[PDB]
Amino acid sequence: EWEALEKKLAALESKXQALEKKLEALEHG
Amino acid sequence: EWEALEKKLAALESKXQALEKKLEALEHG
Amino acid sequence: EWEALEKKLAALESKXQALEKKLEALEHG
Ligand SMILES: [Zn+2]
Ligand SMILES: [Zn+2]
Ligand SMILES: [Zn+2]
């Protein structure tokens, strides 16, 4: 259960980064 | 403590989804 | 281990709110 949560947090961190970069693109057109 | 962590992760996953949906609407809509 | 995971979640929450505000900015021009 704990390790599963950690893997989910890892996934979210990646999505985290993905959205940050996309918003940076959209900000600039 | 465990519950609090799980619920925070679940809330983040939902926010994950809501924000991506809004980004898509802004980009394409 | 636990303490590190809680720090990571708090960092994600903060990024959560930052990107939500950024998206709101973009929606309004
Ligand atoms: Zn559970
Ligand atoms: Zn671990
Ligand atoms: Zn292990």
Ligand SMILES: [Zn+2]
């Ligand atoms: Zn920037």
Ligand SMILES: [Zn+2]
């Ligand atoms: Zn710029």
Ligand SMILES: [Zn+2]
């Ligand atoms: Zn705690």
